[PDB]
Amino acid sequence: ELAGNAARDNKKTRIIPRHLQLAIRNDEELNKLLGRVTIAQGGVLPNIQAVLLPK
Amino acid sequence: TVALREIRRYQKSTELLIRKLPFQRLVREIAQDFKTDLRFQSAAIGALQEASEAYLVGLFEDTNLCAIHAKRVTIMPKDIQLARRIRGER
Amino acid sequence: ELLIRKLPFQRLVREIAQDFKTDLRFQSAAIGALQEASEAYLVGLFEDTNLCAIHAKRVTIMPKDIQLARRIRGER
Amino acid sequence: KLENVFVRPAPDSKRVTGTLFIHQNGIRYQSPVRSDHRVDILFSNIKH
Amino acid sequence: NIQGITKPAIRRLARRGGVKRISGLIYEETRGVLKVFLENVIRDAVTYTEHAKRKTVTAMDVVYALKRQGRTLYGFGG
Amino acid sequence: RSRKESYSIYVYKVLKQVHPDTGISSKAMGIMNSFVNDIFERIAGEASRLAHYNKRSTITSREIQTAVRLLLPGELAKHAVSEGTKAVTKYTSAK
DNA sequence: GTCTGGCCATCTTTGTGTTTGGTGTGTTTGGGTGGTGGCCGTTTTCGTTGTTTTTTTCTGTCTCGTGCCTGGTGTCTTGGGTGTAATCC
DNA sequence: GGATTACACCCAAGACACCAGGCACGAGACAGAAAAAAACAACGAAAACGGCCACCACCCAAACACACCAAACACAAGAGCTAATTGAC
């Protein structure tokens, strides 16, 4: 369910590993459950630290 | 500015950032120190590369956290050593 | 020797246990093991906090060092 | 002489390369930018 | 063959990790860390292979060696 | 030939049950199969350890339920226990 | 010109499906014991009370350390400038 | 005679991050007299844990059965890697 939501959010009709990674790391309970697993071709969440942003 | 452009570009893509042949040569060089005439399925090398890059990216995230904690933009070897000590690796 | 007082710790443990099932009994060795584990855990956490505080060129440990330590450990 | 050497502690806030000279009873560091930033060290005063 | 991990590749890995500025010794430090990691993982994999009485290292050996370390990997037949 | 089993058809059926107009790549189907196998292994290992702690020769639904409670977080464990109890009662009521 | 988007002209092999068929789950019945249930024992956990005294605490005092502000470095890039350069009346 | 003009290309400067020194105000350590309750010991009561014996439903095991699950590869097509740029600002 969450992976299909994530794939529609990207306007795709097929689920790829990227959407699985986004669904897992975006859900608190799942991300706590799958805390040690790495997903091939899953990537990382977009995350830029506050102090690195330009001024 | 190009640094942030690259950060945005690389947190979007998922493609492997190491060239395949250098990583294969490194793997074979390392493996040759445990047993000669070993063969590797291409999927084994692919899995190793995925795991190694995921590990290195997580380590670089912890290193970035340490560097920001010290109030620095620049990551330093002492940051890496501190992150690896706190993880429980060194 | 254990540093947290034994009876206050017993009362804390009972108070926390009062949420998951009403009117539980505890072995004494259970409370002793809990105290040993808690103190070992806290000492390790203070080690990591001291490492972070020294990293920041300081000598005083502050709550953000604890937060960084728990983040790097992978604690929620 | 040994050329293009930095000294620590620096005699001035500005880090500048200097030349180290061997003399009869010690060594002399001498900055090219200012003659007044000489550091003289006697052999008798070196422990290690 | 450890030189094959060039400086741009480490820069790319740090940029995907969100790192904005990089020292000059980070490259050697990272090469050492990667070498240690790969040494451990390949040693475990080769142990699995020798036990299975094989001369080829399969993907199952790598997956079990990562499960041994706690680095569970999905998508390779696990 | 090599007739090796997987969960691909069941995952596909579940997907079409939740998302009708959405497909899945083969690499994601592989990842989902690995995920199912992993979770199975975790639950079965916990159930085995519990059975051996309690000196029993049988893995029943009580062991499975308490392993689910031990493993999953609060709301997730609650929903999963609800689903499991519902299914067990519906299966037991009929025959 | 910045930036995230909704799309393109071409690459690549994937993704959903039908198909053949066989094996693996499903029905049937029989046996043996594991696991519930009940009943009894008795250890052990909670509960309280008195007396002692170590530990906690409130507070004061002073100083040392944290945090803010500064000069100067190296470094990439943008811009104004000028002298080299030169031909036309 | 001598001035108006054509042309590479160098130096001043801005924006970015850092090590080191200095200065200051406060928050934390240390000490001291005081209130607190942990701890030690004692005795009492009894919930519940460990054990035992019985009895049956539950799961393993055969054997025969048929339908759901596997791979091949037919058939249809996801949307990347490629290059320019709708749309607010």
Q: What is the CATH number of the domain that holds F67?
A: 1.10.20.10
The total domain count for chain C is 1
- Structural tokens at position F93: 């009521």
Phi, psi of D39 (to 5 degrees): -120, 115
Q: What is the CATH number of the domain that holds C3?
A: 1.10.20.10
Q: Which helix (H) or strand (E) holds B40?
A: strand B39-40
Q: DSSP characters for C26-72?
A: --HHHHHHHHHHHHHHHHHHHHHHHHHHHHTT-SS--HHHHHHHHHH
Q: Between the CA of residue F14 and those of D28, F9, F68, what are the distances in Å? A: 82, 9, 21
Own/partner contacts of F87-91, CB < 8 Å, gap of 24 or more, are F88/F61
CB contact under 8 A, A20 and F31: yes
Range of the domain at E62: 1-78
| Nearest CA-CA partner of E73 in A36, B24, F4, A24 | A36
Chain B environment of C51 (Cβ under 8 Å): 82, 85-86
How was this structure obtained? cryo-EM
The protein footprint on chain G, as nucleotides within 7 A of a CB, is 3-4, 6, 14-16, 23-24, 34-36, 44-46, 55-56, 65-67, 71-74
CB contact under 8 A, E75 and A44: no
Residue in A8, A30, A39 nearest the CB of F31: A39
Contact assessment for residue D18 and residue D7, using Cβ atoms and an 8 Å cutoff: yes
| Nearest CA-CA partner of A8 in F13, F67, F19, B21 | F19
Range of the domain at F77: 1-95
Resolution (A): 3.9
Range of the domain at B48: 1-90
Phi, psi of B51 (to 5 degrees): -65, -40
The total domain count for chain F is 1
Contact assessment for residue A15 and residue F23, using Cβ atoms and an 8 Å cutoff: yes
Q: What is the CATH number of the domain that holds E57?
A: 1.10.20.10
Protein side of the strand G interface (CB < 7 A):
A 11, 14, 16; B 1, 8; C 5, 24-28, 56-60, 62; D 13-15; F 3, 12, 23-27, 29, 56-58
The total domain count for chain E is 1
